[PDB]
Design a protein around this ligand. Structure first.
Ligand SMILES: O=S1(=O)CCN(Cc2ccco2)CC1
Length: 315
């Protein structure tokens, strides 16, 4: 509305486009998911357009194969790898968009059994594309999606704590206000459970394949982001099964990737509370970690020395 109401509210570029999308979704889901699908397709640098009757008749496999056919056979150069000056902040807007979208959907739409299954399906299928641009765009998106879901789970944890307190204050006094709180307690656990299944799909469907991708930037993206999930939500993500992937990737040929493992590991070891869950990992990868303090790459070696310094200050 008025200059004042707009300024007072102060909506980001990405929040404005998300809120319009969400309203579009509420009028027609199919058209809105179609526009979201064509978003991931166009962000990959694909010239093609998924039509609504393709959306309603075809599987992802065929949609993707059909959209695969509409690339520039000549150029392998796409928005996540174009230098600029436009494409400067595209990558930043592309990442913020995903976060905002899920943040804004996180109380209803996210749970409607259609929006997230449509997205994770497409992103999973694009992530197995032979086309470098599809793998890279989808995989980045999927990683950022995962992070956004982990925040959904963190907010749910605060709401569970609030409701637990409210139930206990009301118990210590069985009217309508109790069973409602017992019912909100149950609904929030069910919400956590559904978020977990989406996280499991993205992890089993995309992360565990892309982390060892041929492209070094894809490897980097996975490793950086699993670092984030482990710091943010240790109970679910910081375990020997997942640390294995951070461990195995210390040996990466490319400096950028190794750098990312080390920074991933710094953010865990820095945390006095997480150290007991790192003991076995330190033992299995001590040699490889410690080797990297004189890594041929100067910027890696620096980060390994910081790591080892953190590891030491722990015990
Ligand atoms: O894993 S933690 O270190 C950080 C998160 N908290 C609560 C939480 C957030 C999401 C689900 O549960 C548990 C301890």
């Amino acid at each position: 509305g008025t200059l004042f109401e707009v300024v007072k509210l102060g909506k980001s570029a990405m929040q404005s486009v998300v809120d319009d999308w969400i309203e579009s979704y509420k009028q027609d889901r199919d058209i809105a998911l179609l526009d979201l699908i064509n978003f991931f397709i166009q962000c990959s640098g694909c010239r093609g357009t998924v039509r609504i009757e393709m959306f309603r008749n075809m599987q992802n496999a065929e949609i993707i194969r059909k959209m695969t056919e509409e690339f520039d056979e000549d150029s392998g150069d796409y928005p996540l790898t174009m230098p600029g000056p436009q494409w400067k902040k595209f990558r930043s807007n592309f990442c913020e968009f995903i976060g905002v979208l899920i943040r804004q959907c996180q109380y209803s739409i996210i749970y409607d059994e259609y929006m997230m299954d449509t997205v994770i399906s497409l992103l999973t299928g694009l992530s197995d594309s032979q086309v470098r641009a599809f793998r890279h765009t989808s995989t980045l998106a999927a990683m950022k999606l995962m992070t956004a879901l982990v925040n959904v789970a963190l907010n749910l944890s605060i709401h569970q704590d609030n409701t637990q307190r409210q139930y206990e204050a009301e118990r210590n006094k069985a009217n309508e206000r109790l069973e409602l709180l017992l019912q909100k307690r149950k609904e929030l656990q069910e919400n956590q459970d559904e978020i977990e299944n989406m996280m499991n799909s993205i992890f089993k469907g995309i992360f565990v394949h892309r982390y060892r991708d041929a492209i070094a930037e894809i490897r980097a993206i996975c490793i950086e982001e699993i670092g984030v999930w482990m710091k943010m939500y240790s109970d679910a993500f910081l375990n020997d099964s997942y640390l294995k992937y951070v461990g195995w990737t210390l040996h990466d040929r490319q400096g950028e990737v190794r750098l990312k493992c080390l920074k991933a590991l710094q953010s865990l070891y820095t945390n006095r509370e997480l150290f007991p869950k790192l003991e076995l990992f330190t033992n299995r990868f001590k040699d490889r970690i410690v080797s990297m303090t004189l890594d041929k790459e100067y910027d890696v070696a620096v980060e390994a020395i910081r790591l080892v310094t953190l590891i030491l200050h722990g015990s």
